[PDB]
Design a protein around this ligand. Sequence first.
Ligand SMILES: NC(=O)C1=CN([C@@H]2O[C@H](COP(=O)(O)OP(=O)(O)OC[C@H]3O[C@@H](n4cnc5c(N)ncnc54)[C@H](OP(=O)(O)O)[C@@H]3O)[C@@H](O)[C@H]2O)C=CC1
Ligand SMILES: O=C(O)COc1cc(F)ccc1C(=S)NCc1ccc(Br)cc1F
Length: 316
Amino acid sequence: MASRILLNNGAKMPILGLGTWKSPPGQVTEAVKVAIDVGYRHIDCAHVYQNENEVGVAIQEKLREQVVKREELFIVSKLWCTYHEKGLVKGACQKTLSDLKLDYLDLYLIHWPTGFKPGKEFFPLDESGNVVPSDTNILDTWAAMEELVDEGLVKAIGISNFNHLQVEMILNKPGLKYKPAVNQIECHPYLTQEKLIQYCQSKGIVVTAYSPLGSPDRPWAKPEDPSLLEDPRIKAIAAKHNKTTAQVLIRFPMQRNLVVIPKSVTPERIAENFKVFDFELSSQDMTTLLSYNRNWRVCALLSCTSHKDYPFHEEF
Ligand SMILES: NC(=O)C1=CN([C@@H]2O[C@H](COP(=O)(O)OP(=O)(O)OC[C@H]3O[C@@H](n4cnc5c(N)ncnc54)[C@H](OP(=O)(O)O)[C@@H]3O)[C@@H](O)[C@H]2O)C=CC1
Ligand SMILES: O=C(O)COc1cc(F)ccc1C(=S)NCc1ccc(Br)cc1F
């Protein structure tokens, strides 16, 4: 398959990237170095993951080493919820740039559509456990993102975890200067998101699928939850193609014209997960994988569900 997808800013984005959530700081430098050595050219990062400095060490080494040119890398980061106010967005982006050892990002996302009270705590809580919102509206945060483009800090801007009505809000913003280039959302056979994906694709937005393996290392996993990697129906599709279950799970979103960002810190798996450009799933296989949808989510958070902009009360 074609290795990059054209964005609405005219740039090309690699359809396979390396995820970094939960990658320990002591292991993520080696993971990113190995990824770049074996061909990855897209890295998905975020301030809230607490490992951007170590990701940046890897990127800098490979650039210094002349393993890859900066123009060939596609580095993504994300604005955390406690930085949605106008006067905090530039400094948040600049901190991420400083940590990653870069003078621009390829893509900067609003991480969640919910703004939180600014401060040191990533999840500021009231005395009863609810997250404390900010009275920032999303549209104002988008205008601050647009300024980053115009200042040269970021080449493209986008959104993450926005539902159908929030995407439409952004698209209908008075005075909109830059459309979102990407919406990064959870997507896998148990949460297939057909409705949201068709909406975004109809509007020219590229969708990135996160948690494509079902995030088996999520901190809130419960021993009895569904497990994609162990699903014998997916194992059977994999066996028919002489591929691993992970390889099928990564190829699946690629054939839906999605970008996909599997995470690993294991060098062998980082390699395995990149070898997905030499087989095709049939239409029948694709439809079968889609049939496994159960509307199950990795990423949701009870403490945030009363926030006015919490995204997952809506159908899509
Ligand atoms: N925008 C947002 O709100 C969010 C963005 N994301 C992004 O998406 C990325 C991917 O999602 P994530 O939730 O991390 O989970 P994934 O679905 O990518 O699963 C990662 C887990 O799968 C394991 N694994 C990886 N490759 C294989 C393999 N070949 N065989 C068996 N097990 C494998 C990893 O183990 P090990 O590492 O030990 O090898 C790790 O435990 C994140 O890291 C982050 O960058 C995720 C959630 C939310
Ligand atoms: O968020 C990620 O990338 C991966 O997950 C996280 C990654 C982190 F480093 C810290 C917390 C999360 C959580 S708990 N994320 C869920 C979540 C956060 C905020 C809101 Br609004 C709703 C929600 F569902």
